[PDB]
Amino acid sequence: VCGIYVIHVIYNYMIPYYWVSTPLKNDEFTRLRMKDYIASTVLEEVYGISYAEWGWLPHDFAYNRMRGLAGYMHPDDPRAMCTSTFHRKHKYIEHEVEKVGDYHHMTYPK
Amino acid sequence: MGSVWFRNRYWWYRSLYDDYVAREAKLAFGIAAFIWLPHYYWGIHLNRAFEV
Amino acid sequence: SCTTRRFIDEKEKLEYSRGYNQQELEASKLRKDFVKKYIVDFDTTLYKTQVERDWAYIAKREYRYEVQLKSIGYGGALANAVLLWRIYANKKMVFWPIPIVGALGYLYFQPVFFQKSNKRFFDMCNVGEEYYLGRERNKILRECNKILNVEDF
Amino acid sequence: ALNKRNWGYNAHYKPELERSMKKVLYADPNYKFPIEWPERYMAETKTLEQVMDEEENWEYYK
Amino acid sequence: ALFFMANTAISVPSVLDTSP
Amino acid sequence: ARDFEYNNQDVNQLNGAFISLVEDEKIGFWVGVGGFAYSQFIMRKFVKSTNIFASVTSLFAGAALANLYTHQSRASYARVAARANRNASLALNKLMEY
Amino acid sequence: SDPFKKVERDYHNERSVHKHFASYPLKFWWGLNKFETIQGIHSILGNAADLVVSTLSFIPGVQGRNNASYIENSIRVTRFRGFDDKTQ
Amino acid sequence: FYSLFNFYLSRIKNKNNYLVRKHLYTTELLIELILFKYKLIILKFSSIKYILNFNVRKFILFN
Amino acid sequence: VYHLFERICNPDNFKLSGEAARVRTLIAAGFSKEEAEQVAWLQNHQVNGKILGLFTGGFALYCCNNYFHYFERYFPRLRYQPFTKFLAQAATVYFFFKIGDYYFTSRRYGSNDARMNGLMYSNTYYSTNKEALIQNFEPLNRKFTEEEVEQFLRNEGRSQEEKRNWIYNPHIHGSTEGEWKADIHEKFDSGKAPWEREHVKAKILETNKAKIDAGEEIQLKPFKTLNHLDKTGLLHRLHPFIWTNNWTLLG
Amino acid sequence: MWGNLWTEASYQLNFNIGFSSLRSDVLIHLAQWQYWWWFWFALIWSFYYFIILKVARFRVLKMRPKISTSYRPHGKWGDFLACIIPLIWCINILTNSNLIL
Amino acid sequence: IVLTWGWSSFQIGGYNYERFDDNGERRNTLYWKLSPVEFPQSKLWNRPS
Amino acid sequence: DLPADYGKMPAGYNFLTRGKDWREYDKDFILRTDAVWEKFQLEHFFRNYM
Amino acid sequence: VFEFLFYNQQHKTRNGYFINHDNLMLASLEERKKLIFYFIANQVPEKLDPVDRVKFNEELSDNLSTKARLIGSLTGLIGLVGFPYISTRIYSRPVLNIGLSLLICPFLYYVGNQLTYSVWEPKFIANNNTVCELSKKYNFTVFDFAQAKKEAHLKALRTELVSDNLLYSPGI
Amino acid sequence: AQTAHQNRYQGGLCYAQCNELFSFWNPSIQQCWKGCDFGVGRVNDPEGRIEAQQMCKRWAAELYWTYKGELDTIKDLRVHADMYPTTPQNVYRACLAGVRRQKF
Ligand SMILES: CCCCCCCCCCCCCCCCCC(=O)OC[C@H](COP(=O)([O-])OCC(O)COP(=O)([O-])OC[C@@H](COC(=O)CCCCCCCCCCCCCCCCC)OC(=O)CCCCCCCCCCCCCCCCC)OC(=O)CCCCCCCCCCCCCCCCC
Ligand SMILES: CCCCCCCCCCCCCCCCCC(=O)OC[C@H](COP(=O)([O-])OCC(O)COP(=O)([O-])OC[C@@H](COC(=O)CCCCCCCCCCCCCCCCC)OC(=O)CCCCCCCCCCCCCCCCC)OC(=O)CCCCCCCCCCCCCCCCC
Ligand SMILES: CCCCCCCCCCCCCCCCCC(=O)OC[C@H](COP(=O)([O-])OCC(O)COP(=O)([O-])OC[C@@H](COC(=O)CCCCCCCCCCCCCCCCC)OC(=O)CCCCCCCCCCCCCCCCC)OC(=O)CCCCCCCCCCCCCCCCC
Ligand SMILES: CCCCCCCCCCCCCCCCCC(=O)OC[C@H](COP(=O)([O-])OCC[N+](C)(C)C)OC(=O)CCCCCCCCCCCCCCCCC
Ligand SMILES: CCCCCCCCCCCCCCCCCC(=O)OC[C@H](COP(=O)([O-])OCC[N+](C)(C)C)OC(=O)CCCCCCCCCCCCCCCCC
Ligand SMILES: COC1=C(OC)C(=O)C(C/C=C(\C)CC/C=C(\C)CC/C=C(\C)CC/C=C(/C)CC/C=C(/C)CC/C=C(\C)CC/C=C(\C)CCC=C(C)C)=C(C)C1=O
Ligand SMILES: CCCCCCCCCCCCCCCCCC(=O)OC[C@H](COP(=O)(O)OCCN)OC(=O)CCCCCCCCCCCCCCCCC
Ligand SMILES: CCCCCCCCCCCCCCCCCC(=O)OC[C@H](COP(=O)(O)OCCN)OC(=O)CCCCCCCCCCCCCCCCC
Ligand SMILES: CCCCCCCCCCCCCCCCCC(=O)OC[C@H](COP(=O)(O)OCCN)OC(=O)CCCCCCCCCCCCCCCCC
């Protein structure tokens, strides 16, 4: 298990580091983001919001929903792209949002 | 629960550690069935306080 | 709110020790009747609005803990005393006193606790005039205020 | 159709009072809001003098 | 985890606004 | 004022079924009374049983005889009325749907 | 008594419990109407009672059934029509 | 109230005297109860198919 | 004897009975085909618990009737009173019945998660349907007005497949062409219900003034059971079970 | 103290045993997780209590020594079976930590 | 020594603290709804921290 | 019927309600039985917070 | 062994609950109006004004409801006759006697009530001046009858559903 | 994170079309998914499509600071693989592409 994890870490973080080491004339930012996507979007620190109710209580869940929406509002974020949506209701019980998508602001969940 | 599910209970005891603590392991269930109630109820109260 | 709950409980205990007059008893009887009709004997989930459903269920759970569970505990204590008495008398284990004496104790202790905490249950149902439960609660409150010659929330 | 949602767009005032003039103005199909909803959250480009002149020359649709 | 908290107080509702 | 009009074909079929069912019901009631009397006579003469048991058996025999006699009209009217009620309910729902 | 209060409509009264546990063991016999034999027994008893009423109708204030009337025949005949115990 | 009163009356009558002919309805009810007990025993110790065959044969013989 | 032979030898007797009986009975009662299906589903769900409990109790009695005899060691009342044993067996049957009834009818609230919705772990669908029906059910306490009856009669030929081409004849319609077109569009094209018209509501209030004086609210809109009952749960925004559905609800 | 608004968040005493403050969401989550950590040890504690009792009572030479004739161990997957509990500990730790992160 | 005291002491202590000290609530506060909640005891003092 | 110019601001309109009768707006708002207590609590909280 | 034992069945053969469009199809105009009014008053009184509700309830109690209850009570007393059914100077079998009485009396009450309804409901509908006058006043239609039928079935369903939890029901 | 589905597989064919349209490392896929969500239940309506486009405009404006007229004066509304949501114009273009890909 440790060896597989270390191999994945190498593939994501060590070998790609050597792909680019000098300024690039063409598509420098594109290539840098290509090499950075595999490392910055690892599921270990991205997955989990789908089962956030395990630790977030209903009111805490709504507060953390608004907090996460504010935090990941930035469009340029592959981590936000790969993260589970915050536009959902607590499975156990919801107290703030009656219907998903019925807001007064496209960003604020309330 | 445990050894009863196996049709070779001697093998069940041998293959884990070659040790026999089944008496205590099966007598502990009765105590464990009630030792948790105070902690569970206080935890319910604490969870309600957190929710409030 | 723990301080508020303690103060309310102590106030109810002091009032019960003090006793009640005719007008106070009439108001308490009206409050208890309203609570029994609209909360204790009615499924709260059948109300229209989610807010009123939630607050009615909160009042119902508070009533359960402060009346039904307390009466069960006191009746169980009385039934256990009777059980010890009968066990000593017969020099054997007896099972009849538990159910019957427990039921009698619950029936005796439910009215007293309900009278002690009648005002709290009535006040906890003040959802607001925008809802049917709140409107009925306000009507009963107006009746009680007229009876008592005072104004209450 | 079941999954259709507004997603917070054009969530302007929804009058509840019976006699509020908005309850009729919004019903009126030929009603123009002071500014389009998408533009309501975008930075202004015209100068102060230009904006004042436009507001002064603005005429109500009725 | 699944039920590590072992209980959730769904009864506790969002406190209702009471301002005039 | 105008009111919902039922289908004339169904009305006529129900009228025929109802006439037949009334005639049956009457004749079958008489047949059931006769069957109860005959069963009581047989039980009290050839059967060694208590009076309560004999009377219960006679009542059940008479009821069964009446039901056997009147089943045809009862079943025909039941099916015709069920079909007519279904048609009327569907028509009224289609009219009042909104 | 005060039938006016009972007539009065109320949300809680309408949505409250009307039939309690004690009534079920005392009223479960009403399901026997499903049986054709029981229906026939009841019809025979009703017809006999109607015949007795008609015979005794000579006294003032008592009127027996008239076969001419459509309503009486229809109500007497369609009482058990379409009976279904499964549908509430 | 009715049950208590009837139990009291029955106990008093039984204590006082018992050699009195009872009503036909009550006698038939008691006979039916005894017959039902015997029939329960027979059903318990006999098969349903055997019971049905015996009853059918008896009915045919009666006819 | 011909009818008796027909009754005995009807092939329907051999043919297995289906679940359409409840739907047909409800349609005869008056419920629409969809409303009949929803009500039949609710009733079947309510009664399935009881049926399953009865079957389970019967099977338990059949397989383990010797437990009652064995228990006589600790409770000789069973040995020396067969009536007590019969009452105990009846109590066991009722216990199984009540367990099944609790499983299939009790609220048993659970989370609205697609991963386990519909697994019967929680009686969420039945609880929500029952709550919605009881909350939103209010019998129409009015009398249908003349305008409503006339509109219902006029709705004989309406169809949404193709819009009707309305033609204005002054000699039979009166008023002006524009006003007649507007009224027709309001009545039929717009889909507005007859009771939603202002004059209809005013007439309803005038006719039911007595109820209003007594203090009873008048329900303009008749109850629509299909607007509150949904066995699939899509109406109540209940997430369908993932493994049996190929789509998702936002919630 | 910002006017009558008391902004102080820590009111710990000289013999504080818990966290300095519980107003922060992170600290609230940590406290709840720590409290519920000890709830899942009932069976293990009871088993160890019984083991200690038996060893202290009957396993001494005086009372009831046992002739241990086993030569060598034969366990093969008991480690896998036993390490489910630390697996649960790790799963809970990862869940709480990632939720906070 | 091993089981009952260890598994009931903290809960008993917290219950008594709530009974007799209002879970250490600092009074003189306004509008409990807006005010923060003073939680009951949650850190196991009997367990090795 | 409406005057066909509903919502138009009258020429010279002044946003003054010096002599307006507020009794006609009583039915447009609902105050709970504890309105006085809520008012006092609001005043206390504002004074002690702002 | 099915619904007819544990479900509600006492409301299906009384109070005109069996009236449907089949009767109305053959009924004349006045008879149809009378039948529709009777069904609406019995099943959904909400459509009637309070005064009409009170008057109709009084008439129904006088004619059918209370009369059937009294006749059922008389039949139940007839069943009670001879209590205790089986007893002796040694034992009285109180539990057996109570069981027999509880089994027999309600059945006799049901038989008597059904007899009273079957006999008098048609006559009450046909030859009641109050019902005739109220039917003429209200002048219900087939649409009203269909709405009342659906509402009555929904009321029966609601009554059955409400009594689901008669022992334990927290709510949430 | 800001989409309407827990994972991209829950979304219909529109999410797959967005993935095909944009490169795996390009975060414009999220904006395309937002456009899909806006277009759910509106593309098949002449007014619904315009409403979805206005929703895209509002979403871009709320995501990034923007001036009045920029989105109207965008020269090319087409999107290529290496287009990133670094500007309101790019966000709006990605949202429009998602709306177009949306089927129902
Ligand atoms: C410092 C000091 C203080 C402490 C400080 C803190 C220290 C921290 C330390 C941390 C250390 C971390 C590691 C901890 C683990 C260490 C383990 C170690 O070292 O030892 C190795 C130890 C060795 O194994 P073992 O525990 O000895 O195995 C023995 C079994 O566990 C035991 O089971 P068994 O099968 O071998 O024997 C029991 C069985 C044997 O008995 C039998 O014969 C079975 C009988 C079954 C049928 C019963 C009913 C029969 C009825 C007949 C008819 C009656 C009359 C009619 C009446 C009708 C009406 C009433 O009977 C039962 O009791 C089973 C019954 C089934 C229960 C569920 C039934 C539900 C329905 C109800 C039925 C019964 C009641 C109704 C009756 C009728 C009602 C109508 O454990 C391991 O192997 C590793 C454990 C790792 C943890 C996970 C394990 C999961 C696998 C399952 C086992 C779980 C239990 C054991 C867990 C371990 C703790 C207890
Ligand atoms: C002294 C006492 C003092 C007491 C004091 C204390 C009193 C306290 C108060 C007590 C108050 C109590 C009040 C209530 C008491 C009375 C209750 C009452 O009315 O209940 C009687 C009740 C009244 O019946 P009903 O509902 O009015 O009859 C409807 C009419 O028949 C109308 O039927 P339909 O015409 O519409 O269609 C069916 C058709 C007949 O058409 C058919 O063939 C129908 C076939 C249906 C499917 C059969 C499938 C068989 C395969 C196995 C099952 C497969 C699963 C599916 C089953 C679905 C349900 C059938 O019927 C006819 O037309 C037959 C002619 C009628 C005259 C003959 C009567 C014969 C007996 C009735 C049953 C006959 C069944 C024949 C079956 C076929 C034989 C070749 O009678 C029954 O329940 C039926 C008779 C008894 C059956 C007992 C069976 C025991 C178990 C046997 C197991 C072994 C055999 C299994 C296989 C079958 C044999 C091969
Ligand atoms: C009849 C209808 C039929 C329809 C048609 C069906 C057609 C067939 C289709 C079948 C398709 C398959 C369906 C399967 C469904 C399974 C359930 C499900 O969906 O759950 C998903 C479940 C969703 O549950 P959730 O997150 O809690 O959400 C709430 C639910 O949605 C809902 O929650 P809720 O609101 O209902 O209740 C809340 C709460 C309230 O409940 C509780 O708190 C209960 C707490 C205790 C547990 C339940 C009682 C246990 C009793 C003791 C054990 C049995 C005793 C008797 C036998 C003796 C045993 C010794 O419950 C929970 O906490 C749920 C937790 C899940 C476990 C408990 C569920 C019941 C289990 C029953 C098992 C027995 C039945 C057969 C097996 C299962 C079915 C196939 O998803 C997960 O949690 C999985 C997440 C995975 C993340 C990635 C993990 C990566 C790997 C990391 C670890 C690696 C370890 C490596 C080890 C290596 C060592 C060397
Ligand atoms: C003999 C049975 C064979 C069963 C088939 C599976 C085992 C095959 C052989 C071992 C290698 C397994 C590699 C699985 C993952 C491959 C892809 C990968 O690394 O990325 C996904 C993930 C990484 O996902 P990610 O976060 O990079 O996500 C990529 C997508 N974005 C960027 C959009 C987020 O890998 C891990 O997380 C690895 C964690 C380490 C532990 C992995 C355990 C795998 C399962 C147990 C295998 C046990 C084998 C035992 C063999 C001997 C006994 C039989
Ligand atoms: C094989 C060896 C294994 C060893 C494992 C390690 C064990 C570690 C734990 C050891 C615990 C030893 C017992 C401690 C008892 C403390 C009781 C106490 O003060 O209450 C705490 C708790 C604390 O709760 P509290 O309500 O008093 O206060 C809580 C704290 N405040 C108020 C500040 C929030 O109280 C109780 O448990 C109350 C009931 C106690 C009933 C039992 C009393 C026993 C008294 C001592 C024994 C009898 C005297 C003679 C002994 C002779 C011995 C030879
Ligand atoms: C579920 O229940 C449980 C818990 O919950 C409470 C647990 O927490 C736990 C966890 C607990 C543990 C792992 C164990 C924790 C540790 C424990 C219990 C031990 C603590 C012991 C102490 C605090 C006492 C320390 C002992 C001492 C001897 C200190 C000194 C005291 C005394 C009276 C003697 C003083 C004497 C001197 C200083 C020396 C003077 C004398 C001399 C110098 C000698 C001179 C020489 C001559 C000749 C005169 C468990 C296991 C549990 O089961
Ligand atoms: C109503 C008021 C008046 C008084 C009645 C009160 C009724 C209360 C509720 C029902 C009570 C049921 C129990 C009755 C007493 C016990 C019956 C009995 O003996 O059942 C156990 C029996 C075991 O079989 P056994 O003959 O011992 O075979 C041994 C083989 N070595 O197995 C059996 O014989 C099976 C018993 C099944 C009991 C019913 C289970 C529910 C489902 C029934 C489905 C339909 C069964 C139809 C049977 C037809 C038989 C002709
Ligand atoms: C009754 C048998 C008692 C046997 C005692 C000896 C064995 C102990 C071992 C555990 C036995 C648990 C048996 C649980 C049976 C539950 C039966 C049931 O669900 O009945 C229905 C009841 C409420 O349902 P109701 O409102 O009546 O209507 C139907 C609802 N659709 O449903 C409910 O009440 C809801 C579900 C409750 C489940 C509770 C299970 C745990 C109970 C623990 C009690 C401990 C103390 C009991 C007294 C001392 C016993 C020694
Ligand atoms: C195969 C043939 C049999 C098929 C049917 C089997 C049914 C098994 C279930 C028990 C049947 C008892 C006898 C018949 C009763 C018929 C009426 C009935 O069942 O009423 C319903 C009620 C239980 O329903 P419940 O779920 O609690 O109420 C929910 C309401 N929404 O009913 C009750 O609460 C009544 C039962 C209470 C528990 C009694 C347990 C001991 C048995 C006593 C029987 C009665 C006394 C008889 C004494 C003389 C005869 C022996």
PDB file of C-alpha atoms in Angstrom, chain A residues 33-70:
ATOM      1  CA  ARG A  33      -1.060  24.150 -15.849  1.00  0.00           C
ATOM      2  CA  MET A  34      -0.991  20.783 -17.632  1.00  0.00           C
ATOM      3  CA  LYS A  35       1.831  19.596 -15.380  1.00  0.00           C
ATOM      4  CA  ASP A  36       0.266  21.166 -12.269  1.00  0.00           C
ATOM      5  CA  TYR A  37      -3.256  19.765 -12.737  1.00  0.00           C
ATOM      6  CA  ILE A  38      -2.278  16.167 -11.961  1.00  0.00           C
ATOM      7  CA  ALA A  39      -0.613  17.247  -8.704  1.00  0.00           C
ATOM      8  CA  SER A  40      -3.033  19.915  -7.446  1.00  0.00           C
ATOM      9  CA  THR A  41      -6.238  17.912  -8.088  1.00  0.00           C
ATOM     10  CA  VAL A  42      -5.408  14.678  -6.248  1.00  0.00           C
ATOM     11  CA  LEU A  43      -8.568  13.143  -4.812  1.00  0.00           C
ATOM     12  CA  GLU A  44      -7.067  12.863  -1.317  1.00  0.00           C
ATOM     13  CA  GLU A  45      -7.628  16.574  -0.589  1.00  0.00           C
ATOM     14  CA  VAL A  46     -10.612  17.015  -2.956  1.00  0.00           C
ATOM     15  CA  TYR A  47     -13.021  14.135  -2.327  1.00  0.00           C
ATOM     16  CA  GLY A  48     -15.197  14.155   0.773  1.00  0.00           C
ATOM     17  CA  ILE A  49     -17.750  16.926   0.295  1.00  0.00           C
ATOM     18  CA  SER A  50     -20.136  14.298  -1.089  1.00  0.00           C
ATOM     19  CA  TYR A  51     -20.364  12.872   2.460  1.00  0.00           C
ATOM     20  CA  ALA A  52     -19.905  16.116   4.390  1.00  0.00           C
ATOM     21  CA  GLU A  53     -22.918  15.285   6.577  1.00  0.00           C
ATOM     22  CA  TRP A  54     -20.700  12.819   8.458  1.00  0.00           C
ATOM     23  CA  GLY A  55     -19.147  15.795  10.255  1.00  0.00           C
ATOM     24  CA  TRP A  56     -21.328  18.793   9.373  1.00  0.00           C
ATOM     25  CA  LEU A  57     -24.615  19.188  11.233  1.00  0.00           C
ATOM     26  CA  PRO A  58     -27.578  20.792   9.409  1.00  0.00           C
ATOM     27  CA  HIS A  59     -26.963  24.391  10.513  1.00  0.00           C
ATOM     28  CA  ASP A  60     -23.206  23.835  10.413  1.00  0.00           C
ATOM     29  CA  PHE A  61     -23.761  22.228   7.014  1.00  0.00           C
ATOM     30  CA  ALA A  62     -25.497  25.331   5.650  1.00  0.00           C
ATOM     31  CA  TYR A  63     -22.863  27.669   7.086  1.00  0.00           C
ATOM     32  CA  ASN A  64     -20.070  25.539   5.623  1.00  0.00           C
ATOM     33  CA  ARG A  65     -21.955  25.403   2.315  1.00  0.00           C
ATOM     34  CA  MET A  66     -21.971  29.192   2.051  1.00  0.00           C
ATOM     35  CA  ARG A  67     -18.348  29.331   3.230  1.00  0.00           C
ATOM     36  CA  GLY A  68     -17.249  26.790   0.624  1.00  0.00           C
ATOM     37  CA  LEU A  69     -19.149  28.554  -2.143  1.00  0.00           C
ATOM     38  CA  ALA A  70     -17.382  31.794  -1.224  1.00  0.00           C
TER      39      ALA A  70
END
